[PDB]
Design a protein around this ligand. Sequence first.
Ligand SMILES: *[C@@H]1O[C@H](CO)[C@@H](O[C@@H]2O[C@H](CO)[C@@H](O)[C@H](O)[C@H]2NC(C)=O)[C@H](O)[C@H]1NC(C)=O
Lengths: 52, 53
Amino acid sequence: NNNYSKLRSMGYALTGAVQTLAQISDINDQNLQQGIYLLRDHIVTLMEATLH
Amino acid sequence: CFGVTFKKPLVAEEKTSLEPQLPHLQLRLPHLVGIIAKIKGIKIEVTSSGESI
Ligand SMILES: *[C@@H]1O[C@H](CO)[C@@H](O[C@@H]2O[C@H](CO)[C@@H](O)[C@H](O)[C@H]2NC(C)=O)[C@H](O)[C@H]1NC(C)=O
């Protein structure tokens, strides 16, 4: 119950949240980019044949 | 017989069937339904950020 101790403990928790939030943000952004790339590739493949 | 020559009668085919030749365009867009089906199932996954933290 030291005045510094229950502050050090909260300092421990106040950084894993930031780290995990960054990780989830990166995962979401990468998934969105991959989906967009797959969609554009399929669209181009479909688009060539009708022109020909 | 005498001076004239005689030839046998000719048999005739009774029926004929007409099957005309048709040009082949060879279009490529048809029979590409699989690509459309693949486009249908993109399935982008997004996980909520902050619910875990
Ligand atoms: C109708 O479809 C058939 C099958 O796709 C076509 O037949 C093909 O024709 C090509 C070009 O001569 C050949 O290389 C293939 O071997 C044929 N496949 C078969 C299974 O016969 C046919 O040409 C099409 N008809 C038209 C008018 O395009």
